[PDB]
From TrEMBL, chain A:
Reported cofactor(s): [Ni-4Fe-4S] cluster; [4Fe-4S] cluster
Protein name (database record): Acetyl-CoA decarbonylase/synthase complex subunit alpha
Notes concerning its domains: Cluster B is an all-cysteinyl-liganded 4Fe-4S cluster; cluster C is a mixed Ni-Fe-S cluster which is the active site of CO oxidation. Cluster D is also an all-cysteinyl-liganded 4Fe-4S cluster that bridges the two subunits of the CODH dimer. Contains two additional 4Fe-4S clusters, dubbed E and F, that probably transport electrons from ferredoxin to the B cluster.
Positions bound to [4Fe-4S] cluster 3: 371, 374, 378, 420
Binding site residues for CO: 79
UniProt entry tagged with the keyword Iron-sulfur: yes
Record's cofactor remark: Binds 2 [Ni-4Fe-4S] clusters per heterotetramer.
Any GO BP: generation of precursor metabolites and energy
EC number, as in UniProt: 1.2.7.4
Function as written in the Swiss-Prot or TrEMBL entry: Part of the ACDS complex that catalyzes the reversible cleavage of acetyl-CoA, allowing autotrophic growth from CO(2). The alpha-epsilon subcomponent functions as a carbon monoxide dehydrogenase.
Organism: Candidatus Methanoperedenaceae archaeon GB50
Lineage: Archaea, Methanobacteriati, Methanobacteriota, Stenosarchaea group, Methanomicrobia
UniProt: [4Fe-4S] cluster 1 binding residues: 35, 39
Binding positions for [4Fe-4S] cluster 2 per the UniProt entry: 38, 41, 46, 56
Automatic annotation (TrEMBL), chain B:
Keywords: 4Fe-4S, Iron, Iron-sulfur, Metal-binding, Nickel, Oxidoreductase, Repeat
InterPro entries (UniProt xref): 4Fe4S_Fe-S-bd, CdhA, CO_DH_a-bundle, HCP/CODH, Prismane-like_a/b-sand, Prismane-like_sf
Record GO terms (molecular function): 4 iron, 4 sulfur cluster binding; anaerobic carbon-monoxide dehydrogenase activity; hydroxylamine reductase activity; iron ion binding; nickel cation binding; peroxidase activity
Known partners and oligomeric status: Heterotetramer of two alpha and two epsilon subunits. The ACDS complex is made up of alpha, epsilon, beta, gamma and delta subunits with a probable stoichiometry of (alpha(2)epsilon(2))(4)-beta(8)-(gamma(1)delta(1))(8).
Binding site for [4Fe-4S] cluster 2: 38, 41, 46, 56
Annotated gene: cdhA
Protein name (record): Acetyl-CoA decarbonylase/synthase complex subunit alpha
Domain description: Cluster B is an all-cysteinyl-liganded 4Fe-4S cluster; cluster C is a mixed Ni-Fe-S cluster which is the active site of CO oxidation. Cluster D is also an all-cysteinyl-liganded 4Fe-4S cluster that bridges the two subunits of the CODH dimer. Contains two additional 4Fe-4S clusters, dubbed E and F, that probably transport electrons from ferredoxin to the B cluster.
Listed EC numbers: 1.2.7.4
Binding site for CO: 79
Function recorded in the entry: Part of the ACDS complex that catalyzes the reversible cleavage of acetyl-CoA, allowing autotrophic growth from CO(2). The alpha-epsilon subcomponent functions as a carbon monoxide dehydrogenase.
CDD domains: ACS_1
HAMAP family: CdhA
TrEMBL record, chains C, D:
Matches recorded under NCBIfam families: cdhB
This protein's name: Acetyl-CoA decarbonylase/synthase complex subunit epsilon
Similarity comment text for this entry: Belongs to the CdhB family.
Functional summary from the UniProt entry: Part of a complex that catalyzes the reversible cleavage of acetyl-CoA, allowing autotrophic growth from CO(2). The alpha-epsilon subcomponent functions as a carbon monoxide dehydrogenase. The precise role of the epsilon subunit is unclear; it may have a stabilizing role within the alpha(2)epsilon(2) component and/or be involved in electron transfer to FAD during a potential FAD-mediated CO oxidation.
Summary of subunit composition and partner proteins: Heterotetramer of two alpha and two epsilon subunits. The ACDS complex is made up of alpha, epsilon, beta, gamma and delta subunits with a probable stoichiometry of (alpha(2)epsilon(2))(4)-beta(8)-(gamma(1)delta(1))(8).
Source organism per UniProt: Candidatus Methanoperedenaceae archaeon GB50
UniProt cross-references to Pfam families, sorted A to Z: CO_dh
GO BP terms in the entry: methanogenesis, from acetate
Amino acid sequence: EWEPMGPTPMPGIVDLRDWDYKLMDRYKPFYAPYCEMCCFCTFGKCDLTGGKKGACGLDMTAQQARFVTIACLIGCSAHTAHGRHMLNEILHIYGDREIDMGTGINIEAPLTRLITGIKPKRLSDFIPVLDYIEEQIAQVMDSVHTGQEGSNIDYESKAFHVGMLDSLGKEVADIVQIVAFDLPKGDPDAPLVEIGMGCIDETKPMLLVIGHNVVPSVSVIDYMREHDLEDKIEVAGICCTAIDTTRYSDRAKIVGSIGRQLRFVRSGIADVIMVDEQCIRADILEQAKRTHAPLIATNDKALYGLVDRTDDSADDIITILVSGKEPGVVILDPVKAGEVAVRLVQIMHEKRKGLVHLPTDEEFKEYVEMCQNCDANCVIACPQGLPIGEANKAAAAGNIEPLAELFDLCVGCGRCEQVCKKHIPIVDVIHKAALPLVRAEKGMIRVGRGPVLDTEIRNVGAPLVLGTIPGIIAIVGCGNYPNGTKDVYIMAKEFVERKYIVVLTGCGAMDAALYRDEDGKTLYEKYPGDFDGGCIVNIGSCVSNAHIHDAAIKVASIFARRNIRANYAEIADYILNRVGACGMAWGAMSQKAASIASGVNRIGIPVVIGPHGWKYRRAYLGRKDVDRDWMVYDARDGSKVRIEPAPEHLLVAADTLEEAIPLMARLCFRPTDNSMGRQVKLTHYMDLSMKYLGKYPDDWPVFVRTEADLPLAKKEEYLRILKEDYGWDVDLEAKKIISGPIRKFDVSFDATNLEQLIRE
Amino acid sequence: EWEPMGPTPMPGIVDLRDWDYKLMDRYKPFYAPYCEMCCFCTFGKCDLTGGKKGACGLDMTAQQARFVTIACLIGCSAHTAHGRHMLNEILHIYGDREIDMGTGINIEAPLTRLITGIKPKRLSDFIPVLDYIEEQIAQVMDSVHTGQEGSNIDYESKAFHVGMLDSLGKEVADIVQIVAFDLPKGDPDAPLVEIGMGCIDETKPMLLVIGHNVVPSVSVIDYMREHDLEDKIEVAGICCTAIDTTRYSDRAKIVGSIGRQLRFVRSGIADVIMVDEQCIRADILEQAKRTHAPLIATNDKALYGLVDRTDDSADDIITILVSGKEPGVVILDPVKAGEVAVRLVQIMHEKRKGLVHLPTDEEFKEYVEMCQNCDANCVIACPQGLPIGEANKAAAAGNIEPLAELFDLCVGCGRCEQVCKKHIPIVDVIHKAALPLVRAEKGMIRVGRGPVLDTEIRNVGAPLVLGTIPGIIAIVGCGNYPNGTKDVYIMAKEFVERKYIVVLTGCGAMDAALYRDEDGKTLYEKYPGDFDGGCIVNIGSCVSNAHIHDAAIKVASIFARRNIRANYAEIADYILNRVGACGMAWGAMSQKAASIASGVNRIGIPVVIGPHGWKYRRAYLGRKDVDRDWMVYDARDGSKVRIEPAPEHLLVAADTLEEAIPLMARLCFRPTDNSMGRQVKLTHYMDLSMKYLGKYPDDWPVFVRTEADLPLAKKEEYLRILKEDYGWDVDLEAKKIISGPIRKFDVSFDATNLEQLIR
Amino acid sequence: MNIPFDIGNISGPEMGRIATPEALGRAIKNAKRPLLVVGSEILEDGLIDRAIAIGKKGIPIAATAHSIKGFVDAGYTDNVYMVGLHELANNIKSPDWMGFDGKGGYDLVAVLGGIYYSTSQFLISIKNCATDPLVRAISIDRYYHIAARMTFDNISRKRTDEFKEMLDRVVQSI
Amino acid sequence: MNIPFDIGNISGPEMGRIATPEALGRAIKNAKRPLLVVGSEILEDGLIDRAIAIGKKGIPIAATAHSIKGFVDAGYTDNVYMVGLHELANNIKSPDWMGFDGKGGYDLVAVLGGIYYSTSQFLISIKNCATDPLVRAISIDRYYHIAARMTFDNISRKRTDEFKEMLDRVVQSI
Ligand code: SF4
Ligand code: SF4
Ligand code: SF4
Ligand code: SF4
Ligand code: SF4
Ligand code: SF4
Ligand code: SF4
Ligand SMILES: [Cl-]
Ligand SMILES: [K+]
Ligand SMILES: [K+]
């Protein structure tokens, strides 16, 4: 009707397998078995070391691919089930809502159209989308059972399929809440909100929300608005429920990212803690009890052994909680849960007044003095190997700065305390030593904008595909960083200053907002929120990541005038060959992060992760030296062309910020770059490499096709280097390259990996 | 309204949590962390040794519960996806059909009615049922994401919930195929088919099917009937596809269980191998190639890197496979797959003549002679710790019996060969030594009967609840046995001889059929296939397990006139308090086996597993010494009564056949046993304990409420033992017990765990 | 090199320590309430004579699997209790369990003649769940029990004579 | 007791062997085409001097992370190559990869000054995938690299003096 039905409507495992092999022929799976064993069945435990086969016949590599498929399935299920739950309640509580994404957006859900072929008109039209994903999830989960897939490649394909389903599941969830709750719909001037551990007014009743599902927090805000309490209660969140709450009310605040959760809970600033689902400290009941804060659990994924009081009156629930007879309750009715939370936080504020939670000065002094500076105890349990013992001894001798420096490097996991015989509360000792800095952590972040406007696509489409806009930089993912939260700030700041399109989501968006420049501005305060070069965009929560894929799709449909209906392979190939983009999950930790990367990769966008990302076991790495791996068709005539490694990798882990920033620029190169675009992209890659690495890349000429590609300011020394250092045949007098480039340049090179797109 | 809608229609995670707590307050979760670490997120790898919490806050026990939840979710998905796949194919290839289970069954789908509240009329009416399961699967999977549930108990409830969904998914899948393909509908005289490594006629083209999805095998049989090839081609299967195929054709045969798979494939008897999904050797392409047998893959769960030729002509596929330019193909169209397999096996049968696959006499000799009798290589890699080296040296010295003995103990996993630097094909060396016995492996098994008939429920209902039929013994599960395949045969034999109702499924049913008694008869040949005491019944494949649940539900509905519509908790409580039953998965291995046990446990039926079952990490064990854990309500007045441990455990692993058989009998005691029924059950428990353990149980008097409960033949001696060894007040002259019993016998005692059933 | 009988049974970082026979015997001797746990493998290679010799030092025996038959056949059943390994583990980790004589729990559990992979999981259960009060679990069997606190190294079945010399040294040290 | 820097990094049964500095040195000496792999931690404790001393013995250096900056600032960039640790692992296990000079792969890989958890996974990639031809990977760093073939035991940072004494002995032995 509205478009011809493409070849892959609601695909199953094999429907897009041939596209996956195009990806994997180039970026072959790479495996690092964090666990060289398998525990999944009673034939085990099987030792797979060195490439052996398990008792079921499954070889080591295929088990690694099976493992990441399971991780992707857990992530995909988390996003899909989040969307399903939200829809189920919106339809029951508020009712069906026509999907109106604004005048500046025609394609409501590019991913939905792209994968299912459906043009959704009402929220109820997403039910068949969810029915398809849930059926697919059970199909692929069946595949991880013992005695199923034996090819590691076909498992990767299954993982890629789960990733694609995750990108669809993310999209269904965000549009559903955007529409039901009238969140921003591409607002380039979205309001800015306060963020940080030190941005909370401790003088007011403080309600803390943790999780990802906003439905319960919507009832909190609506209850507060109904009884005129927005100036009286301080509502803040940790993790994505915070982003979705401030999208609903710019009067709320954000405490911080996952790494901050434990430290804020322990501070005892919160009088009541309302949790929903996903990325919540699994010991939150113990932690909340410790600070005399009632816990309200609102989602059946996480009940914590608490009584289900959904059918009890709010009066009776409050009585139970204020009395302390129960330390928390389950309220699966979000309307009721919002009333209880708001009424309860006012009563508890008074009751908890005066309480002390962090060590006193004397307690602090005792802890650092009793520390035995063990050679290998707490440092060995710490995922970052922080020098806790030495810091303790320094503080015992009057120097607390070593301990204070650990606060931002710590990810708030609590493993150190459990191997310490002295029972020192290390997490609290670090916090105490850093109180001044914690209290000064006061940033400003733009609220989640959601989709990219079709107008923005019309503006950036051509210069993005040409390369003159040097790429979309997507800083997303969890906060299991190797070296603190400032790295993602420096990344976003570096690339926005170079006029990239910088978008952020989830914890990354939060952590980038914590730092201020010499003018005391955060990135969100300094730069506009348009989807345009030189702008900073908070796309939103983790589910909002689907808007990035949507932006790349809208380019293919709006600028390139390609059909998207059930046409995944064609668009993915277009994005891979023409849309300069790179994802960055510097602290990737969760299963959701693995499924997000999978769905980003399948649609043709590379992703860098941090050094913890090796623990996912699998990566997708190219061999820039293998000529046959870099052949692309010219769709005009069908000829095969050997291209530069652009992008060189599909999913790669870097070790340091200084390595990662040049790598991100490198992964924005695309074979269809014109001279001016390649020059813009190469200028930044060469300068960023020289700035952070102190030397130009050993193989930079690979991205030079003609003289018009070299950065203008140093075009002549670059020409000299090519000749004298790379043995290129160059006429320096004429400023002309005679021989050396990997290929000739042609503005009309119709790059494609798909035989079906060849015209002659 | 055929029935009033019960309280738990299409239940979510919290809707049956209170029932799970009733189970778990009595049979508390027990944990043995096979792995003491967690690798699921980049904050890891976390050491949880000694009860520590991970980097996400989750403590050791809650991680163990999460692990078993993932396992159950994988098993639940396998059964649900199998049914969805079959239904979609059936509705497209054959169309919709009315669910007609025959005039001997009124409740077509007891579990569907019990959980969803739906009374299905057509196959298409299972679509909303699958929609429900699949939605729930994604909800609970969401719960296993980092930073979710923190209570180990609530995760166990999520696993129980997944287990219930699995029992529903099993019922859907099987009803669908029973109805779509007119498989037996409770046939007490269902046909017998040949089974075993040695029942295959090697002189005919041999097609081997492996997996669980029978749809491609239906097309094979159908194609063979249409072309008059049923007497010219030998069609046999491994694992459940073999059961479902013989349910369609009594002309097919069954090679055997999972433990036999690698050995049969390595034998090279098969000219063509057609696989579908689940329990297939993941290296089956390698193994097929080695024997020059083309592989036909028919399911997207398992492609093995092969080219998808679903759209190619059957002619072109055969040409490719015959010519050898591809070692196999994927064909997702089952009709085409069947045609190719049948046409191809006739061609390959001729091309494969003259091949030799197992070691020759001389090769066998060189292998056993070159073995270095390593102290700790192959034996350490073997899951059963088999004495391969010592067996090899014995053969080198002229004694092959040690090696031959290993064939049945071996579970065909192949791990031993990979640590042998001498590169000895250990699996094939054991096979060669046992060739005579392998070729003599010719058993007889009754075909999967599927559902229990309503008339059978009415015949056994009262004697089962009162106890005079001493219980349902359900031998099911995989073949990762500790000590060979005869153990399950000996359990089935011992209980049928004692007039239990003995039902079997999957690999268990297969393995029990490989042995013959002194008169040369298999259990399935000697005993009737009626659902009745003293009968042996092959319910069917692993999805057919749901018919066991269904039988217990029908006892509550037909014999006790309870409503089942969306009334899960009341029916489960009924089964736990009155239906003497016990499952046995002596070789439990798969994720499907964990979800089966979970769904069986949730409806109130205990399960014993083999010693490998500790590797699931979690069990459900009672504390018979804790009085407050065994309190039930007398529904007559709401009073609380302490009951004997009956059943003592919910999910428990035993180490040896000799421990397991007395345990199973013990786990059939129920608080509502009458004097005659308890007497029947206690006679067997005491005699079985003496037979296999050489001594009566230390605490057997716990099951004695009155003198009438005592076995008749030794009543006077038991009364003396009660008086002089246990200090009970017993009047030996009057032959009457005065004091000692845990509780007074009261025929009207209405035992229930549910406050809402108090009148 | 310590070789677990199942090479994949690398459970975690806290791995059983190799102990002399004399040290394993003294641990049983120093225990206030030790328990000898035996399995189906005690019915072989005259191993039950060692179990009985240990029992006759005043130590109760948990006869798991069907090992009770060998004690009945051997004529030694005093202070020998029939029990499943599975329920035994759950009971030992339960501080409220008063044991087989009703006087209290056991502070030391020693395994002998047990199926490896089930006995190992029985040991891992106690290691990870019987922490307060701490119950020490040791192995005097022929296997290297990585899940035990203290254990012998692997002794192949063809070197069983060596295992019996070491076990006999355990008995003499109690 | 060998302590992995991450106590939870118990990957499997084949655990890296403690080796003397002389044995690690000789393994580099005996290699036909050794490769030194350094990460971001080489930029501390004058550890790059040790890396340059090794390179100056005719051994190529893979400068991972941003360690190339330290080599630029030190004035030694010959036979030193900028490369990512991840792509390096994929390359070493690829038998068709002809190295940084185009002459072939490397038979011995030695890690020094690397972030523990990423270098460990780098080592585990080689141990598990560089099997034919076999590539031997060793650690001369301050960590017990359980994923290395041969390694030192853990040397805490407050004992970095001792680590340097051993690392210097490695250099002396090449
Ligand atoms: S699933 Fe396979 S590799 Fe894993 S434990 Fe079972 S037999 Fe071993
Ligand atoms: S809480 Fe911080 S210091 Fe402690 S182990 Fe975790 S990251 Fe390290
Ligand atoms: S484990 Fe405790 S005593 Fe030891 S160095 Fe760490 S904080 Fe200090
Ligand atoms: S580390 Fe993970 S995959 Fe390995 S045994 Fe443990 S739970 Fe299983
Ligand atoms: S899910 Fe929790 S226990 Fe597991 S690796 Fe992650 S932080 Fe550790
Ligand atoms: S194939 Fe048989 S002998 Fe070999 S390891 Fe497996 S069970 Fe043991
Ligand atoms: S590993 Fe090989 S050589 Fe050693 S005992 Fe086993 S079969 Fe013999
Ligand atoms: Cl194109
Ligand atoms: K560490
Ligand atoms: K073994």
